[PDB]
Design a protein around this ligand. Sequence first.
Ligand code: FES
Ligand code: FES
Ligand code: FES
Ligand SMILES: [Fe+2]
Ligand SMILES: [Fe+2]
Ligand SMILES: [Fe+2]
Lengths: 183, 183, 183, 433, 433, 433
Amino acid sequence: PHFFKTFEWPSKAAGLELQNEIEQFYYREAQLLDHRAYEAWFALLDKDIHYFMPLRTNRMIREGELEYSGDQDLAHFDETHETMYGRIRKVTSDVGWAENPPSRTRHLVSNVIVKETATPDTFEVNSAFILYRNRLERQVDIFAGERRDVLRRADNNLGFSIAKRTILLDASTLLSNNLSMFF
Amino acid sequence: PHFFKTFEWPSKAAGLELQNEIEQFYYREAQLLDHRAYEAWFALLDKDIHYFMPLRTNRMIREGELEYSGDQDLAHFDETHETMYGRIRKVTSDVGWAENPPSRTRHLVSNVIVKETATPDTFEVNSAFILYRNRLERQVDIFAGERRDVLRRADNNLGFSIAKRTILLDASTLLSNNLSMFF
Amino acid sequence: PHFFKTFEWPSKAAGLELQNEIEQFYYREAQLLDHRAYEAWFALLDKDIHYFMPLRTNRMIREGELEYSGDQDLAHFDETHETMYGRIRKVTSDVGWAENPPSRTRHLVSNVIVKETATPDTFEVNSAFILYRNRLERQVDIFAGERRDVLRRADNNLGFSIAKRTILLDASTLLSNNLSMFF
Amino acid sequence: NWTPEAIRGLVDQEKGLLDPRIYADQSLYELELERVFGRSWLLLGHESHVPETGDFLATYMGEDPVVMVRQKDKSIKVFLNQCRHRGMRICRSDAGNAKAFTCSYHGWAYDIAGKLVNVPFEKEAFFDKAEWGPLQARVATYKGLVFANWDVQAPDLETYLGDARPYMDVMLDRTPAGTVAIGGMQKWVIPCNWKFAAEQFCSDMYHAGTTTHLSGILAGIPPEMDLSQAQIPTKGNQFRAAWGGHGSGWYVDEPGSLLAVMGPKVTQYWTEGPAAELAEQRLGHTGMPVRRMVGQHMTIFPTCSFLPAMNNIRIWHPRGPNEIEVWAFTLVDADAPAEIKEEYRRHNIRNFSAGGVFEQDDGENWVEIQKGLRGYKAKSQPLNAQMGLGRSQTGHPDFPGNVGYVYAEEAARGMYHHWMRMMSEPSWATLKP
Amino acid sequence: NWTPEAIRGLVDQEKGLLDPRIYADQSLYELELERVFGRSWLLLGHESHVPETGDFLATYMGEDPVVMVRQKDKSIKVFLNQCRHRGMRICRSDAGNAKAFTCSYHGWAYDIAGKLVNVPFEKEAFFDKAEWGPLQARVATYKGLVFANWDVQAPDLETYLGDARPYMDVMLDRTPAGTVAIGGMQKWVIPCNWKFAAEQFCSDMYHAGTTTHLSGILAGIPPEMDLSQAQIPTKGNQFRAAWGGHGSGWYVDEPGSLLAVMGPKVTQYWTEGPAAELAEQRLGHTGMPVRRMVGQHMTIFPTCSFLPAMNNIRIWHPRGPNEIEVWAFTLVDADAPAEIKEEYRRHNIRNFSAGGVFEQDDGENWVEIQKGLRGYKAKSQPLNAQMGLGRSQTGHPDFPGNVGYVYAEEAARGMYHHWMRMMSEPSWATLKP
Amino acid sequence: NWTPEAIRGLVDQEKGLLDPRIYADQSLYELELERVFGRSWLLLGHESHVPETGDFLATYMGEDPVVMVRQKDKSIKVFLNQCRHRGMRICRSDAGNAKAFTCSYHGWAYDIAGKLVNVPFEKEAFFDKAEWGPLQARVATYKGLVFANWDVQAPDLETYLGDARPYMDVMLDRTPAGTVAIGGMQKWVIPCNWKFAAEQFCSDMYHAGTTTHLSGILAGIPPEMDLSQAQIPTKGNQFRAAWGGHGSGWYVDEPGSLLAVMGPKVTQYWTEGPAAELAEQRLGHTGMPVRRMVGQHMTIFPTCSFLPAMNNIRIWHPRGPNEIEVWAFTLVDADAPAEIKEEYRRHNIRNFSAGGVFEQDDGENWVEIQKGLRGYKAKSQPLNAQMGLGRSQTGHPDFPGNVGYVYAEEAARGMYHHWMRMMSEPSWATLKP
Ligand code: FES
Ligand code: FES
Ligand code: FES
Ligand SMILES: [Fe+2]
Ligand SMILES: [Fe+2]
Ligand SMILES: [Fe+2]
């Protein structure tokens, strides 16, 4: 019962220096978010960022191509540099009630799998996360998923910029009242 | 109170290269499971795999020896290569209702501790995990535990085969209706 | 808004060997706690340990400086080597009902960020955790946060001692009936 | 026990008062499921969700799981997603195409119309299959929008909507080609009563005109502008339906509300040029100057809410007194330029999804509201719905029906009064318009 | 208040209709805890769970925690795991060995019989200790299985089981050596009503003979075989107890699903050779050809369920109308070869644990049934329990009792009819056999 | 419905018997919110929590969220944290300083007194603002502590407290400077009824003199000392208030409890030297030899609890029958040496926070009791409350009021009795002292 994957040879393994560099980048990025340093975080995002979190649905196996929303469909996020900017303005605003008082998040990053692209200093990265959101007195929202990034070497604080991010969230119906956090 | 472990010398540290390889192995394994690449995941199991998940119980400290089910007792899993195969046959079946429509999982892997054994290219590995399973509309089952593996260098995609796996789950009563997922 | 962090230089990256060594120390620390080797874990604590978990509260952004309890306030923990000892004596006690029968915990560690201090062989480390605590029949308590440690190289089994630990929990109100676990 | 008399005193549209128990009380909730959700026309989606023979959507009607399916003859059928044998879900995916439906429990098989057509071992173990299929709802379509109702004695949809139809038409009746749904339907959970949501879209521009959406507006205005430069719209009108509790409110000649939300390209589409002219010409029979209606909220009672200029559509599924699910999607004109379709898709994501710069703040309100109502005193005094009392009339030279000022609780007072009616009058003979 | 008239309307065994409310209503459940679980015989485990003086197991009777403890005189005692001082749990671990029990709260001390033998500071603060020990249950043993009943007025165990005993004996009475439990008791939680669980094991071979276990069977056959080569049986019978809600169903002469579930070494052990022939002789007095019974399910009302050829046993602990815990173990003949015992252990884990290739699909069904019952229209019509109506006879030449076909709901109607009786007849004078 | 007759039979102080349903029944709980929490004086914190004008604390009265705010005139106002327009939370942070409070939903604005002083679009849309502000509570102070009551016909604070005040003064009235709250208010959640917590601090020194805290003591004793050396305090007394349900118990002369819990510096400060002799002089009018009172617990009914020598204070917020929140802080004398304040801070963290070596074990008992009460038979018989029954006298030479032995349930019977009285006497005419 075989798959076309069988004819492909696995990618070049990321070297140790690079594996560490990219892990360290995500850890420092999670710190930014978990400390609410939103302007600092927004500075990581490339001007050509597409930040995309598609909808995920329950489908029978024989309709698996239909699991996620498409190119022209609604999504939970489908953002550009300019649309993210407005989000930053809202979340840092005194009159942004959803995040004033601020929520308390933890982004636990792991499973970082790195691939060198045809373009030097540009990398495709796949990683897993659990995002713990705690809000107000007793609200707890826990998210799990994977992130597919295109990262570029850059002369910012952290040494990389995020050129693309796709968030595949392990949910159909969102169990949270909102997505007032960044992934 | 002192313990007999005090007469033991710490096990030799796994080098940087071997540490990263084994980590990457697990991340790629978790990818396979999370993307439901079951045939491909089954290929990582050595023919002499013992895949074991004992029952865990509430005992007083003076009866700690009784915390886990034994060799000759029931378990949540106690599988060979053959019985795992039937389980692959069921999970990939259009008429396997528990996983058609399929669940959405995330295996977040960390805490990878590597011990080289007396046989070169065979390793004992202890790791921690959180397994987030979201199913149908609103169902969320969260597991945590440790896995104690024996891995051999193998000539497959990922470079390692799973010779033995034991999963110690932090649960007595299972809070989930099934274990339709793989650990 | 611009911030005073803009005038700071990024920290000197921890070398790969040091990164691995410290990550492996935390994984082994987690295993000790998760296996209830309380005495062995207590051996990891420096005699000058200050073990602190401040309260955390909901504050408007404009009162952000008041988020956590202060030096002279109540806290969840605020412990010295002597007081931690007493806690170790209780948890290992046959008449310590909260932990007899013991709970089942998983300490998942990631995001390990290492800073070398002025004093060689002393390190500031910031890491993230999820702590999954399962108790008796059906109780599950999930914590998330970050740990701010100062570790010194030591001639113990694990190679480091914990000189300071501050736990920043992503909670205001504790959703657990107790903190009978260690962080 | 809730007597008709007890229920009538939960609302007072005279003094403009609401009893806060209406949102927290379990008994009242169980009654709603029978008296409100049991016999109301509820929105299930759009004709475009199910264009082909066998195409299906699995959705809800209250807490009753239903399957919406397109028939060979082109009609849409709606039947309960429950096997009458032992209660199993017949249709087990979100959406897709079916040639049949088979129960997974004991394998009772159904055709795409919900007719029980095969019982395994029927000869050997058995009863008339034609009397044992899933309960069927009535199915009624308004210009794309698919509605459904369990009740045989309920008013037809057109009669149910009545004079609210011109306001729906502002969104739904603008092109000969009709609207279509953009792909994808978002789902999330808010711990609040459905009436906070259904009301807000029925009657409440007030929250968007005051403090709730100060930060969402900020997200949509240019980077060079701050909030003190923001145009505070005060001009507009509010419609209370003659019967049903339906409601719509909109801004008039104040595009700044619509600009920040939907951007220049959509704001132009809606107000100036061929499309907008055609739309005003098509809505001619109403006499309504729809090119001047620049930002609107609407609710068809109980749980069908939408925002006619942004074309965000949503169903509120009740989940007890203390929770809802929101199922959202978005409509475009089938013949709108691909530029304008894309503007609608992006800006609806940006503003109105779970992560949206408006949506975040609406639900933040409702959650804390529902939380307070767990208190004894929190429920002991009535709430104030006195805004715009006796200020509405049907004379209006621009907009038909009972029309008043954009900041008013008339549409609200109507919705709640219609909620109260349905909850105190058991017979459609007294209740119908 | 649920009147006896109203409760008697909930189940109709004549017409074969079930009111879906039985599985959902909170008030009926509160009544079940009193009228059913409060006075029925409930399975606690096996004699081999507590083999020695002081060995205990912490388990449940309904939602009451109880301690089952082996006494010095070799009898078994069952008391409420609750201190009569302020209600603390007396026995705080799952199982093990005790010389005494002591409450953690204020130190009231008990012997292994559950008798209060010490109260700290009795002379200073006091009352007869002999009157203040935990409530005791009636205890009784049927061929290794330990049952308990709170009610002093209830019929003794043998009378309560009645003509259900022969069908229990197929599993429990095959050797002079008796059965023994394999070590370990699995525990998991399913969001469903206990009656779905108990009914299925009572009466429902149908779900296994149709759709539910296509994939579990697939997992069990030779790798070289596919489903269209599997022999899913059609021959067998169903028993309904003369009294008490008990029922069993089994395949006759058709080993296919026994072979697929338990493999060839267990199947042969069960059907042919010395041990199988002894079993037939031991059950000779029943007149049953037990060697031709290959795949059987049983329930002893309310919540004691097992699968004789595979030897899987389950206790359903109720957790409200919307939840159960499943406590599962497996039995082997105490003198079975080590080989057979190991096949039993292996194949029980494979098929019937929480991760079992059969069990995954049993619960999958129940989860979705129960979610649907939150709906108003989902409870508004009766469920079909008409299968095998009128087709059951008492005078079958091979199998004793009221006997019908293997795909039938006679046993189901009997179970729901007795449930109904227990819920509406408050006194044993009318309820007893 | 619960008749007054039914409620009266839930507690029997004469026989010392308690109906376990009181801790589990949902109907009783809803009744409690009205008849108990809706008209009791409940602790909100200390005056030092809000020292300056505009300083606020968002806390609870029952499940009613309230704001406690310091006024310019130096008074303290407490009002419902709920906006009367549509129910929004007015004060959205835990604590801090406000110039005003504005509602985030529609923008109704309030001063620090809770008076509604602005309504956006009041002229265009509208009604007296002075009648649409949040509900105010009576506010009264006892030696630092802030209590509040909704019921205008309830006894003033001093009257409500009555003869319990001497035992509170042991902690609150030791110097002219008065107490101050150490900064910080810990909050945690326990799945148990509030009455177990209230009773324990009211009447239960027994749990601590027996088995619950053996390890807590072990944590605190010298490392060169095992539990067998630890001292067994047995000498002491217990007070049942004349009216109200209040209670206290304490050890006399035996300082092993205190020393292990609070260490040698707090012990010496409490019993020897200038501050100890000042405290005893200050309480001379009571006749109480307070320097001999070493380790003490107290509850001011319903839910105000504390521990005089360790100065730990708790409010229990009810969250349904099956859950509470614990809000905790500590008090020190305002002029206590820095050395002493710090010892109070440390040891309160060590022993009494969520991770406390004492607290871990208190909640372990309560979690399990509440779980057990899910059972039908667990609720079928009364609990024993007969300790020291008929042994308390009203003329003790050292301590004023109805006084018994340290190990007794007289205060407890009094607490449950006054509870029944509040639940069954709708009128302060009968209920008041
Ligand atoms: S429940 Fe559908 S066939 Fe039985
Ligand atoms: S509760 Fe058992 S001794 Fe008090
Ligand atoms: S809810 Fe407070 S102003 Fe509307
Ligand atoms: Fe809004
Ligand atoms: Fe089954
Ligand atoms: Fe205590």
